[PDB]
Design a protein around this ligand. Structure first.
Ligand SMILES: OC[C@H]1O[C@H](O)[C@H](O)[C@@H](O)[C@@H]1O
Ligand SMILES: OC[C@H]1O[C@H](O)[C@H](O)[C@@H](O)[C@@H]1O
Ligand SMILES: OC[C@H]1O[C@H](O)[C@H](O)[C@@H](O)[C@@H]1O
Ligand SMILES: OC[C@H]1O[C@](O)(CO)[C@@H](O)[C@@H]1O
Ligand SMILES: OC[C@H]1O[C@](O)(CO)[C@@H](O)[C@@H]1O
Ligand SMILES: OC[C@H]1O[C@](O)(CO)[C@@H](O)[C@@H]1O
Ligand SMILES: [Cu+2]
Ligand SMILES: [Cu+2]
Ligand SMILES: [Cu+2]
Ligand SMILES: [Cu+2]
Ligand SMILES: [Cu+2]
Ligand SMILES: [Cu+2]
Lengths: 333, 333, 333
């Protein structure tokens, strides 16, 4: 394959490596490296720990961005410091179980897979070693997403360009942390040691935690997402194992691809959209009002109580036409 | 804001206050009042009780209907006879967490919020005080919906008007009533007293009851929904916290906006549609056959066993072309 | 009704009786017979048993295929060897609870129902005797699907014919098998004897098993689905009670009707789609690569651990342009 090669420096979520939307480039081989890391992490503000398994150290794995007709060449590395075999499956790719059947690597090995980006949209990628290990590796954190843009950029299905000013990637993770008899979350010395209890819980289908970017509160405070009034923000949302229903509290989805695929026109003016487990979707919104927004899954129990809330802090001028407090709280006459 | 003012007399669900579909009116300030009521109610035919919190005394809160570009001015009242702070968040509105950040009122207070109806469709509204109180107030009943109609009324996305002969609002409520050791549902003296047990159950994500209009069997018997053969009925369905899959048993969704937003064309000829938790959707059907219909969520366990069944009683002439019993039950030859 | 009559020989899933896509035939009365069978079956590779209730002996019931405007005349037979009353409800039909209100038959009886196929798409049919029996009969296996094709065959919504080379019907079944105190699955002597424990479990909303074609591994091994590179395969997927999220691992949904209704254009290029509980949907894919594929629900816990995995074995030539292993696993430099 005699095409130009381009390296990408991946960046940790929720940020997204620099890329063009519309491009004059033709097909290239776009080179990415993912290095697997198994590690024990803290997942909530109480100090609960979790045996995570990750691409590039993060949950989710980083967003990869290419254009239709590019070839995506990934070097997947499984250092000898890990304990388990791993692989990678791209929902964007055609053949060999998405790549999984060509990428199984033991600790100490690496592999190089190339796939042609023939389908546009946002797509999940995840580890899938085989059998019961498939769900376990995924719900341990081994999932991310790839975006395959049209070469002319995004459009509204009516002939008009949609151009985003910035993009964020929100990866949602269902986590299954068992409890002891008295009701405290358990801690484990290794992923292998966590497996039996964790699988028992998994099969009951109810997560203990549902988080964005790997942790309760990850996308809040210093790490809130940001925008200004007038900016059009693309929010890519993935969930590799379990459904979600994103909602921007105080905003909308102006243009939404909930099934995540750019060969389809977006829907307009949504309140809440739906990410099928095993997929990525995307929503664009032009901010109109300053202040704090919450970005949630709109099962509010999961949002407020299990971890699945992000914030935006938005700068700009308040628009009293759109909303105003006519009378502040006062005693009832 | 120098626009005409129009008061609306809200009516309890499943009915909907009188309104125009297509209108020659221009933008107005449309005035609504919602008075919060915390109250213990009965939710099933066994006499199980429930610590409800409501807008205007009902579950769901009443449907508000306006047109695109109207300004919706709501007086939210929290009488001193209530125990908790409350607010209101409109998914139809832009800014301040949908209004929640401008409407927090203690018992004995009221507040007046105005928002411009810039997005068409059906939308959830709900209380959202902050933090863990958000899901608790919602699943205690503090949710309803608003419909923002195009000024030209509804259309099919192909240039033709859809006009409904009547509209009903079905609000679905997931309820979390704990049980005692021997397995009976518990009763509580106050919402505050119900909170700890109720939150514990909430986080396990499985409701004890899933009801329409606040109670098992609410929309049956004397209170069945009604229609005649030839009538086009709009059914607005909301679920502020948890997914649902509406289905009209013996009918269809002729025109369905499952994501609920009129800037999108409806889908046609559905059997079952999907209401994302945190949203409202809408379906229109022209009745063709008389008799009883059931309107359900098509998780039939929730429909038949947890409470989520309504009936329609339809008058008119049976159509043997559409369906006929060729041979009544008989012994097998 | 003076139309020609045509008998169909039904075939067991996942196969589909022979039919035309586009046809020059006009409306006919298409005759089907379904014979109910209650039977104890094995549902997993451990030998767990299950009190099934079936149409024609299979889970799912067989796929019925007709064209728009046909009249579907079904003889439903409930032999005296069964223990319970049964009926049939077609989501494709108009009136009488889909037919259920006209087809209730005791053991030893049969009934003949005709309905006009006025809505195109794939649709669930299921038993629905009344009250709590409704979910129980459905989740015991009493559900299948019917496909109502346009007379001109399928199209892409842009004026082009879609023609499938073969069709498979994947019926997904949520099953609720209780466990004893020590944690083993229970066995029962009759459906009636299984009812109390099974209903208790049902109302908690978590299945023990989620299977395709009635059993873990049913659509694997000798019974894997098959295709060749270049073949366009239609996959009809139904779920009468509970949501699913189909995904073809290593492939896509080239054209997908997730809500299942052919009056709507398909979506294109999906990774994962969504079958609402109480519905059928359909996806077409043209295979591009040989080898094994897994067809799953993409809650991977349900796929890998609860039973919901099928395989395709695909013959043909590997396409190194679409995907290639650039470097096989090797030691990290
Ligand atoms: O971007 C996918 C498609 O979107 C729309 C355009 O009309 C079409 O030309 C383009 O191919
Ligand atoms: O109602 C929203 C839109 O529906 C369609 C019409 O073609 C368009 O003119 C209208 O604005
Ligand atoms: O198949 C349903 C419809 O699909 C599209 C065609 O333009 C239309 O003529 C047809 O009726
Ligand atoms: O935005 C994508 C959509 O836009 C169009 O190109 C033009 O309407 C469609 O063919 C496609 O589905
Ligand atoms: O019904 C709403 C839909 O109808 C149209 O106005 C005409 O096709 C579209 O632009 C819109 O999405
Ligand atoms: O494929 C079905 C779709 O195709 C059309 O006939 C042509 O665009 C539409 O009217 C219909 O919704
Ligand atoms: Cu792995
Ligand atoms: Cu996958
Ligand atoms: Cu409240
Ligand atoms: Cu909300
Ligand atoms: Cu039955
Ligand atoms: Cu049904």
């Amino acid at each position: 394959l005699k095409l130009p090669r381009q390296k990408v420096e991946l960046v940790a979520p929720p940020f997204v490596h620099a890329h063009e939307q519309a491009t004059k480039q033709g097909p290239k081989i776009v080179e990415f490296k993912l290095t697997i890391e198994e590690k024990k992490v803290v997942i909530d503000e109480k100090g609960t720990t979790f045996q995570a398994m990750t691409f590039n150290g993060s949950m989710p794995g980083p967003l990869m961005v290419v254009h239709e007709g590019d070839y995506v060449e990934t070097t997947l590395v499984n250092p000898a410091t890990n304990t388990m075999p791993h692989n990678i499956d791209f929902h964007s790719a055609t053949g060999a179980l998405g790549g999984g059947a060509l990428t199984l690597i033991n600790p100490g090995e690496q592999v190089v897979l190339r796939w042609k980006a023939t389908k546009t949209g946002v797509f999940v990628y995840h580890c899938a070693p085989g059998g019961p290990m498939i769900p376990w590796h995924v719900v341990s954190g081994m999932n991310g997403a790839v975006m395959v843009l049209p070469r002319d950029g995004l459009n509204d299905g009516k002939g008009h360009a949609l151009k985003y000013d910035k993009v964020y990637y929100v990866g949602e993770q269902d986590m299954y942390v068992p409890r002891d008899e008295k009701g405290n979350f358990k801690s484990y010395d290794s992923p292998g040691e966590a497996f039996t209890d964790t699988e028992e819980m998994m099969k009951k289908l109810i997560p203990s935690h549902v988080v964005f970017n790997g942790k309760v509160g990850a996308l809040t405070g210093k790490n809130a997402l940001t925008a200004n009034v007038g900016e059009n923000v693309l929010i890519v949302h993935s969930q590799a194992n379990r459904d979600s229903r994103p909602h921007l509290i105080g905003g909308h989805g102006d243009y939404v691809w909930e099934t995540g695929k750019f060969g389809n026109a977006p829907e307009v003016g949504l309140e809440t959209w739906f990410i099928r487990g095993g997929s990525a979707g995307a929503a664009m919104y032009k901010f109109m009002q300053p202040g704090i927004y919450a970005y949630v899954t709109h099962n509010l129990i999961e949002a407020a109580d299990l971890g699945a809330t992000a914030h935006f802090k938005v700068e700009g001028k308040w628009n009293d036409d759109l909303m105003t407090q006519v009378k502040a709280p006062a005693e009832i006459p």
